[PDB]
RNA sequence: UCGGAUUUCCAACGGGGCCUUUCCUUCUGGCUAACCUUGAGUCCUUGUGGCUCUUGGCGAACCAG
């Protein structure tokens, strides 16, 4: 049921991922009990400068915690099957435009529906399960934003091999440049 | 004091500054899992408990509020967080 | 810009530990807490003698930078420093001013106490304070031998030692003397210890 | 209470330059402050600097090179028109040759010479030379 | 400063300080110029080749010229393990 | 700092940088919300409820573990009192000082402090009367205060 | 080239229309051009090529309310 777990739009790699996903359901009595209603929206394939590529799994919002129960073993199994594809979970957060001076009647846009909140949720989920312990934005002399992001010391090694992939993801989704660091 | 780093202070000197007056502010307190021997049970207690945290079953005051920190009862196991 | 030839010697480190150069002052100023290693529980701080050694190395570099060896002047109103400065300048070629500093020795181009240094070296910046203030008017660099509560006004390169114990003072002048002479070329080999004992720079009384 | 923030920021920058230091810590931060320091950084009265988040309102650490003589704010933000610039550049700058009275126009915050070139005007924040 | 012919029209270019990069003026007598001798492989000073530093009268008078010269020397590799950039 | 006095006292709680839930805390959101409702039907104020939740039950902050504050939850349950807590304690303290002045007619210091407290009441009541969390008919009066506290 | 002339290249300097989750939204009637149904002709390498009409629709524009 690879089109069941997809949503009205088949794509080649989406059918591959959903097929492997049903196969991972079949290798488990309880992971199938969670992952069978857990559908997902779409994918993005984007290459890194280290030879391989990465897959942003676009997941709907109100099921993301159930993924966060299970995304550890699921990213492990999907890094087993589809090699040289770094597995990333990103949610689908529709932004709203900022109203101009000639802006016909639209309701009070939530803070979550803004640009920067969605970018912050992106950075929250890119380094799941570890927590960003701080953001320090460095402004160069030529006026070039480099966002330094700090990471914890509990779950280093799960993300430590995925760093340049995360840089490529963030420089592709918005064009802003970013540097991760783990403090001593 | 002419050229120094304020982005990366030394952790010892940064450890002595006031709670509100660090680089990024944040608390100096913590939590505890305590066990009274009369129940063998984990009770979670904040380090600066303002009320007398009594155990679940027995009427044993596990900590008393005195100024800054709560004084633990005599004969009580504890561990942080 | 330094070979590993310049590094700290075990013999010199034994000397510096024997002289109580590490025993710093009780109270420490703001600008010399880099030089503190730690505070003993009796209230005496500990001076990083490796930092001290490399400060002597850089001071010896600066002393080597003056071409004519006469413009280097050593200064002491300290009693033990009188002995140390006299024997230093004897072995060096520099000129000494022991005891009381005549004011207007660096100003006042008429008088007989008029000297024109290009470097002033000071045992105690508190006891020789007027020499610092005099050097602050005619563009002279100042090398001082500062203890941990010594005032650092108008000073250049300052060496953390103990100005209380006479062994420390004589040994600091001793090591600076030998390192300057090794940098000159009269002490061609570096393996050679300086043959004159540090007892010649220590102060005596019958 | 604390009424202006760019004023306090330039106060601290100017005091640390008077003492000859290298860095400052500004608390809080603002968008206006960031744009102002970008205007400074474009001509290069300062080197690089850095935002710090604490979820409240950021702090800023500024590296300041040696080049700032004096910066300041004009605290009632006066409305200015185009020729009016020739008044304020006659008041605040040390010469006709350099110095930047900076304006807040509807096309952003920038120095007065760009607003000559873009042919806009607005309000006034401060002066840098 | 130059003219319209592109030729310079000043009396002298001032020396700037190194600790604070400000101008050492024609009568700052509390300022100081430092020479540190370039060494040989044997540890002999090269006679006519120095590394120079400029420490202005404000810098020196405030009580900072020691620490600042330590910083400048270790950043130019004349010291090591003395000046710590974090305090 | 410190209107109606002169101190520059800073003594407050910090707030940790972590927005999200604690790592070691392993209870349910509905569990702590039901605990809040239980303590509210016991008859406590949200300050007291937050204190008892971080002392006994290890619940650090209500907006950390749940998406709502304590006052949003008591408003969602129909347990919000008729006036907010701070105005209530100010009127309570004013009633205490008023009774003390009714006993002792000579304490000029209690008179001065009562004037300060009533000033603080009027400023905070203008704030609550602006944002429509209090009816515009409402006005602090003496016998009205004796009715509202006693 | 018989003092000024405008291409190519080059920095620059401001500006407009877009695309990146995104800027003026419609309903009802008239006005041009383009994709499609339908068969017809003028040109040239044999043309569903280019130029032009025939009844019915969609998209981008012009106007009214």
UniProtKB/Swiss-Prot annotation, chain A:
There is a cross-link at residues 80-81, 121 (Glycyl lysine isopeptide (Lys-Gly) (interchain with G-Cter in ubiquitin)). It is found in: Cytoplasm; Nucleus, Nucleolus. Keywords: Acetylation, Cytoplasm, Isopeptide bond, Nucleus, Ribonucleoprotein, Ribosomal protein, Ribosome biogenesis, rRNA processing, Ubl conjugation. Pfam families: Ribosomal_S7e. One of its GO terms (molecular function) is structural constituent of ribosome. One of its GO terms (biological process) is ribosome biogenesis. The keyword Ribosomal protein applies. The keyword Ubl conjugation applies. N-terminally acetylated by acetyltransferase NatA. GO terms for cellular component: 90S preribosome; cytosol; cytosolic small ribosomal subunit; nucleolus; nucleoplasm; small-subunit processome. Component of the small ribosomal subunit (SSU). Mature yeast ribosomes consist of a small (40S) and a large (60S) subunit. The 40S small subunit contains 1 molecule of ribosomal RNA (18S rRNA) and 33 different proteins (encoded by 57 genes). The large 60S subunit contains 3 rRNA molecules (25S, 5.8S and 5S rRNA) and 46 different proteins (encoded by 81 genes). Interacts with snoRNA U3. uS11 interacts with MPP10. Component of the ribosomal small subunit (SSU) processome composed of at least 40 protein subunits and snoRNA U3. Belongs to the eukaryotic ribosomal protein eS7 family. Present with 41000 molecules/cell in log phase SD medium. This is Small ribosomal subunit protein eS7A. It comes from Saccharomyces cerevisiae (strain ATCC 204508 / S288c) (Baker's yeast). The lineage of its organism: Eukaryota, Fungi, Dikarya, Ascomycota, Saccharomycotina. The gene is RPS7A.
Curated annotation (Swiss-Prot), chain B:
Component of the small ribosomal subunit (SSU). Mature yeast ribosomes consist of a small (40S) and a large (60S) subunit. The 40S small subunit contains 1 molecule of ribosomal RNA (18S rRNA) and 33 different proteins (encoded by 57 genes). The large 60S subunit contains 3 rRNA molecules (25S, 5.8S and 5S rRNA) and 46 different proteins (encoded by 81 genes). Component of the ribosome, a large ribonucleoprotein complex responsible for the synthesis of proteins in the cell. The small ribosomal subunit (SSU) binds messenger RNAs (mRNAs) and translates the encoded message by selecting cognate aminoacyl-transfer RNA (tRNA) molecules. The large subunit (LSU) contains the ribosomal catalytic site termed the peptidyl transferase center (PTC), which catalyzes the formation of peptide bonds, thereby polymerizing the amino acids delivered by tRNAs into a polypeptide chain. A zinc finger (C4-type) spans 36-58. Its cofactor is Zn(2+). Present with 43300 molecules/cell in log phase SD medium. The gene is RPS27A. Binds 1 zinc ion per subunit. One of its GO terms (cellular component) is cytosol. This is Small ribosomal subunit protein eS27A. The modification S-methylcysteine is found at residue 39. One of its GO terms (molecular function) is RNA binding. GO terms for biological process: maturation of SSU-rRNA from tricistronic rRNA transcript (SSU-rRNA, 5.8S rRNA, LSU-rRNA); ribosomal small subunit assembly; translation. The N-terminus is not modified. PROSITE patterns: RIBOSOMAL_S27E. The keyword Ion transport does not apply. It is found in: Cytoplasm. Its main location: cytoplasm.
UniProtKB/Swiss-Prot annotation, chain C:
N-terminally acetylated by acetyltransferase NatA. Keywords: Acetylation, Cytoplasm, Ribonucleoprotein, Ribosomal protein, Ribosome biogenesis, rRNA processing. It is found in: Cytoplasm. Its main location: cytoplasm. Disruption phenotype: Reduction in growth rate, a decrease in free 40S subunits, an increase in the amount of free 60S subunits and a decrease in polysome size. One of its GO terms (molecular function) is structural constituent of ribosome. GO terms for biological process: cytoplasmic translation; endonucleolytic cleavage in ITS1 to separate SSU-rRNA from 5.8S rRNA and LSU-rRNA from tricistronic rRNA transcript (SSU-rRNA, 5.8S rRNA, LSU-rRNA); endonucleolytic cleavage to generate mature 3'-end of SSU-rRNA from (SSU-rRNA, 5.8S rRNA, LSU-rRNA); ribosomal small subunit assembly; ribosomal subunit export from nucleus. Coiled coil: none annotated. One of its GO terms (cellular component) is cytosolic small ribosomal subunit. The modification N-acetylserine is found at residue 1. Component of the small ribosomal subunit (SSU). Mature yeast ribosomes consist of a small (40S) and a large (60S) subunit. The 40S small subunit contains 1 molecule of ribosomal RNA (18S rRNA) and 33 different proteins (encoded by 57 genes). The large 60S subunit contains 3 rRNA molecules (25S, 5.8S and 5S rRNA) and 46 different proteins (encoded by 81 genes). Belongs to the universal ribosomal protein uS2 family. Present with 93700 molecules/cell in log phase SD medium. This is Small ribosomal subunit protein uS2A. The chain holds residues 2 to 207 of 252 of the full protein.
UniProtKB/Swiss-Prot annotation, chain E:
N-terminally acetylated by acetyltransferase NatB. One of its GO terms (biological process) is endonucleolytic cleavage to generate mature 3'-end of SSU-rRNA from (SSU-rRNA, 5.8S rRNA, LSU-rRNA). Its main location: cytoplasm. GO terms for cellular component: cytosol; cytosolic small ribosomal subunit. Disruption phenotype: Reduction in growth rate, a decrease in free 40S subunits, an increase in the amount of free 60S subunits and a decrease in polysome size. PROSITE patterns: RIBOSOMAL_S21E. It holds the Pfam family Ribosomal_S21e. Keywords: Acetylation, Cytoplasm, Ribonucleoprotein, Ribosomal protein, rRNA processing. It is found in: Cytoplasm. GO terms for molecular function: structural constituent of ribosome. The modification N-acetylmethionine is found at residue 1. InterPro entries: Ribosomal_eS21, Ribosomal_eS21_CS, Ribosomal_eS21_sf. Component of the small ribosomal subunit (SSU). Mature yeast ribosomes consist of a small (40S) and a large (60S) subunit. The 40S small subunit contains 1 molecule of ribosomal RNA (18S rRNA) and 33 different proteins (encoded by 57 genes). The large 60S subunit contains 3 rRNA molecules (25S, 5.8S and 5S rRNA) and 46 different proteins (encoded by 81 genes). Belongs to the eukaryotic ribosomal protein eS21 family. Present with 27400 molecules/cell in log phase SD medium. This is Small ribosomal subunit protein eS21A. It comes from Saccharomyces cerevisiae (strain ATCC 204508 / S288c) (Baker's yeast). The lineage of its organism: Eukaryota, Fungi, Dikarya, Ascomycota, Saccharomycotina.
């Amino acid at each position: 049921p690879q089109a069941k777990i997809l949503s009205q739009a088949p794509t080649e790699l989406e059918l591959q991922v959903a097929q492997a996903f049903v196969e991972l359901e079949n290798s488990s009595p309880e992971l199938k009990a969670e992952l069978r209603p857990l559908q997902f929206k779409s994918i993005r394939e984007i290459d890194v400068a280290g030879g391989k590529k990465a897959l942003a799994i676009f997941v709907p919002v109100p099921s993301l915690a159930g993924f966060h129960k299970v995304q550890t073993k699921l990213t492990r199994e999907l890094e087993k099957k589809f090699q040289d594809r770094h597995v990333i979970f990103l949610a689908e957060r529709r932004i709203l435009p900022k109203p101009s001076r000639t802006s016909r009647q639209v309701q009070k846009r939530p803070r979550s529906r803004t640009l920067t909140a969605v970018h912050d949720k992106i950075l929250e989920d890119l380094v799941f399960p570890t927590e960003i312990v701080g953001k320090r934005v460095r402004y160069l002399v030529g006026g070039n934003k480099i966002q330094k992001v700090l990471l914890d010391s509990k779950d280093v090694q799960q993300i430590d091999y995925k760093l340049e992939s995360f840089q490529a993801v963030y420089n592709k989704l918005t064009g802003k440049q970013i540097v991760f660091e783990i403090p001593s | 004091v002419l050229v120094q780093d304020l982005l990366h202070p030394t952790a010892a000197s940064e450890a002595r500054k006031h709670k509100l007056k660090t680089l990024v502010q944040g608390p100096r307190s913590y939590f505890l899992d305590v066990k009274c021997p009369g129940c063998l049970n984990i009770t979670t207690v904040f380090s600066h408990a303002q009320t007398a945290v009594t155990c679940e079953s027995c009427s044993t005051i596990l900590c008393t509020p005195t100024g800054g920190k709560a004084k633990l009862s005599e004969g009580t196991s504890f561990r942080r967080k | 810009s330094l070979p590993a030839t310049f590094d700290l010697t075990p013999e010199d480190a034994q000397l510096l530990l024997a002289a109580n150069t590490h025993l710093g002052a009780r109270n420490v100023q703001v600008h010399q807490e880099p030089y503190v290693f730690n505070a003993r529980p009796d209230g005496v701080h500990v001076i990083n003698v490796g930092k001290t050694w490399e400060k002597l190395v850089l001071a010896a570099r600066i002393i080597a930078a003056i071409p004519n060896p006469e413009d280097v002047v050593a200064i002491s109103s300290r009693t033990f420093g009188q002995r140390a400065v006299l024997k230093f300048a004897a072995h060096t070629g520099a000129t000494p001013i022991a005891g009381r500093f005549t004011p207007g020795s660096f100003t006042n181009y008429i008088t007989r106490s008029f000297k024109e240094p290009r470097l002033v070296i000071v045992t105690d910046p508190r006891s020789d304070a007027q020499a610092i203030k005099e050097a602050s008017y005619v563009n002279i660099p100042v090398i001082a031998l500062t203890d941990l509560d010594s005032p650092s006004e108008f000073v250049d390169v300052a060496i953390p030692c103990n100005n209380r114990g006479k062994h420390s003072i004589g040994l600091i002048w001793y090591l600076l003397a030998r390192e300057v002479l090794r940098l000159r070329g009269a002490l061609v080999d570096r393996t050679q210890p300086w043959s004159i004992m540090p007892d010649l720079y220590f102060y005596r009384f019958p | 209470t604390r009424s202006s923030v760019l004023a306090d920021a330039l106060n601290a920058i100017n005091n640390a330059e008077k003492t000859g230091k290298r860095q400052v810590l500004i608390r809080p931060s603002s968008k206006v402050i960031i744009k102002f320091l970008q205007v400074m950084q474009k001509h290069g009265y300062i080197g690089e600097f850095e935002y710090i988040d604490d979820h409240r309102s950021g702090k800023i650490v500024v590296q300041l090179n040696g080049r700032l003589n004096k910066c300041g704010v004009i605290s009632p933000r006066f409305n200015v028109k185009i020729g009016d610039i020739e008044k304020w550049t006659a008041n605040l700058l040390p010469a006709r040759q350099f110095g930047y009275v900076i304006l807040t126009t509807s096309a952003g915050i920038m120095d007065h010479e760009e607003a000559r070139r873009k042919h806009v005007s607005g309000k006034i924040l401060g002066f840098v030379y | 400063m130059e003219n319209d012919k592109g030729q310079l029209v000043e009396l002298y270019v001032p020396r700037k300080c190194s600790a604070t990069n400000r101008i050492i003026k024609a009568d700052d007598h509390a300022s100081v110029q430092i020479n540190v001798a370039k060494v040989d492989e044997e540890g002999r000073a090269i006679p006519g080749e120095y590394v120079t530093y400029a420490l202005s009268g404000y810098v020196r008078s405030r009580g900072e010229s020691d620490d600042s010269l330590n910083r400048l020397a270790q950043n130019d590799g004349l010291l090591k393990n003395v000046w710590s950039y974090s305090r | 700092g410190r209107m109606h006095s002169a101190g520059k006292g800073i003594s407050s709680s910090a707030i940790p940088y972590s927005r999200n839930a604690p790592a070691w805390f392993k209870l349910s959101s509905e569990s702590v919300i039901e605990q809040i409702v239980k303590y509210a039907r016991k008859g406590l104020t949200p300050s007291q409820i937050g204190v008892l939740l971080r002392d006994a039950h290890g619940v650090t902050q209500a907006r950390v573990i749940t998406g709502n504050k304590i006052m949003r939850i008591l408003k969602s349950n129909g347990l919000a009192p008729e006036i907010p807590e701070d105005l209530y304690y100010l009127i309570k303290k004013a009633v205490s000082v008023r009774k003390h002045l009714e006993r002792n007619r000579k304490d000029k210091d209690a008179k001065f402090r009562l004037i300060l407290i009533e000033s603080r009441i009027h400023r905070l009541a203008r704030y609550y009367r602006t944002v429509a969390v209090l009816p515009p008919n409402w006005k602090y009066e003496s016998a009205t205060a004796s009715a509202l506290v006693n």
